Structure formats: C-alpha cells, structure tokens
Design a protein around this ligand. Structure first.
Ligand SMILES: [Mg+2]
Ligand SMILES: [Mg+2]
Ligand SMILES: [Mg+2]
Lengths: 495, 499
C-alpha cells in the first residue's frame, strides 16, 4: 500500500518546521545486499567531509552504523577563531572563541527528540584535539606544535545514512536546518532536503566492483620519537615526581610514523577485521578548498562520556585480557589506582549533574569483545537543567586514563616530558547531536593519515613501581596495533 | 602469511589418510558482501544451490551458509533411493530412501575438525511429510497432486560460510572419499582447488545494486476450503476428540497463487518482514539439471537439533508481537489458553526422544525460557537427551517425525484422521527442511511458513491444532492468516523496484 521508501511528506514537514529547528526528511530503502562499508563506498565515495561510525557490542556489531554522506559545512578553528569550512551557513555562529561558537550553534539548533528516527539523525561529527584542554586549564607551552591541527573540527552532518544490520535496510536522512528561525522558505527547504535524499538514493543505485580481498601481515617500517633509553628517562623522571608526592599517576606517550600509500578506508577495513571495538571511525577532514586535508581512522576501545536523554555515563576500564572464564576472575582478582580515576570521574560528572544523582558502580561488569575482554566500572548521573552534553564533555576532558591524577598536575608533567603537542592523541572523536545527546571515544588506537604519512601515538600510565623498558614496550605494542593495520592494508589484493 | 592461503596439498594428504570428507578451504575478506550478495554471486539461483540463515536470541547469527552448487542429490525415484545428477561411484543407492541415507552418512562419517565453520559439509534438503508413510501404516485417501519426492538432499560439497562479525567468507570445497582408498588424493586436491577458484572468481565480479522499495498489496490467491467447509472438518475432528480417538489433531489446507517473482525476492521479503531462526531458500534440481522447484521459507520452529550426541527440541508454547515489550512478555508468560495442548506436545517429545536416547538422560524443562527476535518473542519448552551409542542424528530426526505440532496426539491416530479429512497429500507441508552434516550433527526446521514455487505457481499450506473446544471459523482464520504471512510476502516481492 504505502511503499517502503515513502518519503516524509511536504505536509508533515511543514507541521514539524513550525516547531523544530532541525527537521529530518527521511526515506527507508531495502539494502540487504549492502554492508556499512559498501554503502559508505557508494554514498560517500571516500570524499572530504564524509564519515563512517560503527560499533562492536558483547554481541558483535550493534544494530546501527552511521554514514555521513558529505557535509558542505564544518565548524573548526582558523587563526585562533571559530570558522566554517566550506559553506558558512547564513546566521550560524562564527568568530570568537571556538567553544563559545560551538555552544551557540548547539543552542540554536536544539531540537526535541523525535520518535521513529535512528539513534543519530543529525549532529556535529568530528574531534576535539587533546590541546583543546588548553582552553579549559592553564598549561605550559613547551612541546612543539608540529602537526598544526585545529583544536576542533566538527562536520555538520545533515545528510546521514543509518544502516540497520538487523533489518537489512538503510534510512536516509536529509535535515532541513533553520538557522534564523523564520517561516519564510519552508517549501524551498523541503525540496532541498528531498533533492539530497534523491542524490543519496541514486548513489545507492549504482553498481559496485568487488572488494573481496586477501592481505598479509608484514612488519611495519616505522619511526619512533624516543628510543627505549629516552622513554626510560621519561618514565624515571615521572616515578620521581610520584614518589615525592607530586602526582599519583601520569600518562606519558610518544608518536610513531610511517610512510604509506594505503587508502584510509583500507586501513579501516584491517582495523575492523583485526581489532573490532565499540568505537570504529573513519573521518575524511576537508581543507578550506574542498580537498582532503587529512583522514582519521581508529578503533578506540574506550569512551570518554556518553550522554543520552539527560543522563551522562562513563565506563573507565580497569584492565583488559586477550579473551576462557579464567582470564575473567584473573582480572577481578587484580588489586593492582583504577579507583583514583573513578574518583576523577565522580568529581567530573558532579560538576554538571544534579546533586546526589552521580552513582558509582565499582567493577560493575566485564565487557567481552571478539578478541578481548574489559573490566569496567560505571559512573552515571543526571545532567543539571542548565547543563548540556557539551558541558559533560568539557567536564570530563581529557580522559584521566590519558592524563593522570591529579589531572592538572599530570598534564603539566606530560607537557614537560613530551616532545610534540599531542594533537588528536588523547582527545576525542564522536558526535554531538541536535537533540542534546553525545557519544565520544577517547582518541587512542588511531592513525592520522596526511599526504602519504601515517601518525600513530600511544602511551601508558606511569605509577610509583613503573619500569621504563616495560612501559616503553607496552606503549609501542599499542602503537603497533595501528601500524600493523596500515602495513597490512598496503598488501590488500584480489585472492 | 596471506589471509586467503589455501589448505596445502601436504596438509590435505595427511588429512585424507584418516578422514572420509576432507575440506580444502580459503578465507577471504568480504566486508562489502552480505549473505544475499554472496549468494547472488556464488549461486545465482542455479539448481542445486541453497541459502540458510538464522536469526538468534536478537540479531542474525554469526554464520550464514551458501551451497554454491551441488552436482549430486539423493532423492527418491520409482519408490527407491536414487541420485540425481552425478551418481557417485560406491555411493549407496536403491532400496528404502532412509536406509540409503543412513548408509551414506555412515560411509562419510568424519570427525569434526578444529577451525572450521559450524557447517562445512553435509546433506541439505527436505523430508516431505509423506515420508512418514514409510515409517507408519497410514490410509491412502488424499490425492497426491503435487508429486513431490519423499526426500531430496543436496550433497553440499562447495560451501561458502559467511561470517557476519568478521566480514569474511570461508570458502570450502570438500573432497569426498566414497571407496576409502588413497588412489586419487592429488586429483582430489586439484579438483577441490579448482572448485575454490570458481567460487573465488565469482566473488570477484562486480554486482548491480539491489537497493529497493516494495509495497504490500493483498495477494490474489485461491484456497481449497471455504470457511464453512473448514468448519465441517473442525467439527468432525472435535467429535472424534470427544469420542476419545485423540487429544488433538492438526488439520490444514493448501493455498496457491500465480507469481512470476524470483524466489530470492520472496526470501528477501520474508527476511525483512519476519526474521526467524530458520530461513531457507533451496533450488531443487530435476533429473536433467534444470530447476524442478524452489522452496523458500522462514519457519519459526525446529523439529530437532542434534549436536555432539545431544538431541534437543524446543516446542513453542506461545508467541507475542514484541518497556511495553516487558508487558507483552508478562502477558505471554501468563497466557494459559493452550497450556494443555502444549504439555501434550512436550509429552510426545519425551516419547520421541526416549526411543533414541540413553535411559535417564531425557530431561523436560516445561516453559524454560523466552526467545527474543526482531519482531516476535517465543515462549518455549525444552526436551533434551543424550543419544544412545547405537543411535545417530538421523535416528533422532525419524523418531521425532513428523512434528507433534503438525500432526496431533496420539500421533498415529491424528495422522489417520488428517488423511481422512484433507483433500491432498501434504507434500512438503509438515515435513522438515534442514541438514545432516558429515560429523553426525543435524538441524531441521518444521516445514511451515514456507512456499513451494514451481512453474509460475506458489503453494502455501497452513493449519492449526484442533482440541475439544475449538471452533471452525476461528481456526479457519487463524490458519488462513498463517498462510497469508507467506502469500503476502510473495505479492510484495512482485512489487520490488528501484526507489
Ligand atoms: Mg599500567
Ligand atoms: Mg509417554
Ligand atoms: Mg490453537
């Protein structure tokens, strides 16, 4: 009767637009011969301003994957001020402090949750660099900024494809965004969104060449910033501070790099098959001319904070094992510090949540993924009425597991011992939606790919009993998870 | 080393000295393929191909299975076991089909090997309901107008196992050693590698889009019985139950419709509309290697599953449509209208597994748990036992066959009464669709919510249990609505189009 792919009607759109800043025009299609990756290849074609977000659950892949089909606009930092790349939307906040411009943007577009939509239907998708913390806390300026990344870059994801693995369907969404709050051009906005659905629908109609492949796992030819001896000097320095009482924990790191001609999407494919995680992402970041500035590809196992319907939640990980029930109780029985970070998170959420709503849940459960298992503690709370999801992000930022405790003192020492500004490393990758929700991964196990070079940073917590060579090795192993994927992706070939 | 490294000749040789069925395998990254796209590339609706998928208690299970094309099938011709296509040298044929099948499984029995997908070789296909006539003496009153064979099992030697979590496909080409000699080991290896290369080449091809819309028009269909005719049957059976002939009996009737739809398109509509633990598409070959007919279905209920010497059945007590979901669960748990009917079937399952299991191992868990799928939830019981040392998976299938759910209690009297009231032989309806693997395992769905598609006609049969308090009009409509689930899918499939 009604067709599966019936598009939101002009009449229904009109009625919503009288009440809502961001109105989705949607169309569902049967896509039972597509995967999230094949849909990405058709809809995004690896273009600048596109994205793919996937999530392993402990039941394999979650129901939904999200493709950003191509954002004409992105909110970033240029010459120390908020700026839009691509189209600067008329009436959208610009200039001045970037966090204020972002806050103003989210306030302007705040839209009531609507029933019948996929979990993410519009939003700002991208990253905060670790160095955004420099705007939340005063920190020295010693490390060299050789990567030149912006403190933030958020794609205005108005064209989204939501892939429903269970149903074998894709819900295409093209949002109308009412920046100025007028009623003047409702029909134009509907026709505009419908045209964008038609572009995505036509893209899905194209044939696709095979990507059925083999790959091998060669050693990555890569360079490191620190030798084992140099990293050992760092670790020993920090163990001194910890013994003298300056901090309880500090997380140093270093950066690794390798030459690669591999496509970022192929790197994503190797990470997906090798290191499936709750936060898989590929982001193609545009430069100011509409070309590709760089790509971010990562498989992060840990969130910073998730905000859903007023509730903020964090899952700091105590420990992890290689995945069988004896590895489990072997981790609950590790009394080897976790709860100092659970303490940091209790404080962090307390600053944005209603009094008494912040609950902790010591070692609440394990999380079994495909090739690993995690022991997590849960901290949740209810956001105050004058606090947004963005406030939750800034309150928690950066992860304590990526800085130390006390956080500010830990970050001061980090700045002292490291060579270069971290850039993305230890920041976050994720989204803020227009309904006030957010989900951000800690930016670890991530490559930054730019003009034939891949950068991979990794580190690890240093305490009083820490050994330099052991910590060097642990951190290099974390980096090698990504470097190995890049090396392997270069070998992809037809079988 | 390489992901797609093929089983080496030297490893194959070593295995071939101990094992009758030896897989040569090759795993590939196939993260832009789905089970349906892989089926379209590998099998392409050819005769002798199949697709098996399973929703799990609340996604698709890890593995989907494609039978990429079986040259050989074991069936029935002129009332005796016979192979279609290639009759393998030394393979059992003639006589009773269940004997020939038992002899085939005996010959090919091969230890489960580490590192393989869950189904790596076996016999895939169906038993018609009317196979029961070789197990029990029943009257011959109903007309056999479909002409189906009592069984047809594809010898599935070329399989593609699709791993949804990894995004990989494990291609398997089995070498089958019928005579047990080592004469032709290198030829067997080369033949398997060649089969792997055919499947690999097929996966390397481009593929046109299948992104689609469809609508849901009412199906133009025909029935055997009107409501009043069906009521006469129900009233007759209620009388037999009141008289003590039986506790419950499951009549049915056949529906049909014209269709030019591709059976895979029917499959696709069933898949998106009601994913079930047993989805299947089987393209059944005729004796000349053309397509005899296709079987497409989404059955919710197993006959029996045999894994590692343990036989289990899960009779469904009730179903609900899916926090308002918590209330439906509560309601489902508290609904007792059909409890006695369900417990009678649990009792039959105990009878059945008792015949093949080691005394003291048959365990019954009344109303053991709820199974949660995308659009429905099932309240189920469990009957399980350990097979006796002299009993095989096939003995468990035959002991359970046909399902009490599709016959009645006591089973033989119920089948006699079915034969008295139905117009036509059931054919596939009330039989099973599934597999027996070469390692002694089995998993069979009851053949319900299934279409048989042949030469532009689709047949869909459906029925339901009659008990002392049943009424004709209600039971007619409940069974007609079961059939309509499939007829509706067929009518919708004809509308599939580019959006
Ligand atoms: Mg440590
Ligand atoms: Mg009994
Ligand atoms: Mg009933």
């Amino acid at each position: 009767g009604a067709a599966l792919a019936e598009t939101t009607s002009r009449e229904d759109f009109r009625a919503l637009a009288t009440e809502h800043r961001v109105v989705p025009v949607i169309r569902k299609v049967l896509a039972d011969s597509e995967t999230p990756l094949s849909a990405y290849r058709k809809l995004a074609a690896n273009r600048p301003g596109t994205f793919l977000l996937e999530s392993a659950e402990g039941r394999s892949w979650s129901r939904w994957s999200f493709i950003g089909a191509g954002a004409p606009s992105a909110l970033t930092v240029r010459d120390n001020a908020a700026a839009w790349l691509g189209t600067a939307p008329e009436g959208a906040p610009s200039g001045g402090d970037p966090l204020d411009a972002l806050r103003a943007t989210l306030d302007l577009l705040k839209t009531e949750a609507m029933a019948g939509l996929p979990p993410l239907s519009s939003g700002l998708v991208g990253f905060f660099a670790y160095d955004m913390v420099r705007r939340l806390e005063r920190l020295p300026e010693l490390a060299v900024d050789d990567l030149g990344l912006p403190d933030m870059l958020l794609l205005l994801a108005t064209d989204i494809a939501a892939v429903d693995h269970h149903e074998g369907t894709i819900t295409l969404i093209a949002n109308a965004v009412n920046w100025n709050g007028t009623d003047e051009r409702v029909d134009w906005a509907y026709d505009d969104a419908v045209a964008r659905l038609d572009v995505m629908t036509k893209a899905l109609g194209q044939p696709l060449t095979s990507a059925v492949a083999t790959f091998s796992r060669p050693a990555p030819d890569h360079r490191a910033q620190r030798t084992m001896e140099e990293y050992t000097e760092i670790v020993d320095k920090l163990v001194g501070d910890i013994e003298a009482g300056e901090a309880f924990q500090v997380v140093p790191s270093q950066r690794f790099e390798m030459d690669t001609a591999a496509d970022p999407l192929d790197v994503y494919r190797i990470l997906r098959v090798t290191n499936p995680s709750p936060y898989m992402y590929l982001l193609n970041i545009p430069d100011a001319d509409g070309g590709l500035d760089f790509s971010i590809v990562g498989s992060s196992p840990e969130a910073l904070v998730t905000v859903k319907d007023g509730r903020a939640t964090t899952h700091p990980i105590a420990g992890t094992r290689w995945r069988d029930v004896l590895l489990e109780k072997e981790l609950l029985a590790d009394e080897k510090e976790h709860l100092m970070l659970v303490d940091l998170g209790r404080n962090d959420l307390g600053r944005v949540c209603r009094p008494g709503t912040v609950r902790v849940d010591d070692y609440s459960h394990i999380e079994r993924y495909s090739h690993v298992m995690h022991l997590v503690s849960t901290v949740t709370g209810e956001l105050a009425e004058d606090k947004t999801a963005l406030d939750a992000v800034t309150a928690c930022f950066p992860a304590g597991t990526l800085s130390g405790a006390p956080k500010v003192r830990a970050m001061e020492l980090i700045e002292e011992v490291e060579k270069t500004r971290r850039g993305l490393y230890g920041g976050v990758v994720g989204y803020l939606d227009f309904a006030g929700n957010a989900d951000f991964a800690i930016a670890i196990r991530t490559a930054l790919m730019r003009n034939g070079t891949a950068y991979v940073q990794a580190g690890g917590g240093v305490v009083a009993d820490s050994n330099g060579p052991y910590e060097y090795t642990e951190a290099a192993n974390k980096a090698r998870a990504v470097l190995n994927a890049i090396a392997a992706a270069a070998t992809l070939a037809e079988p």
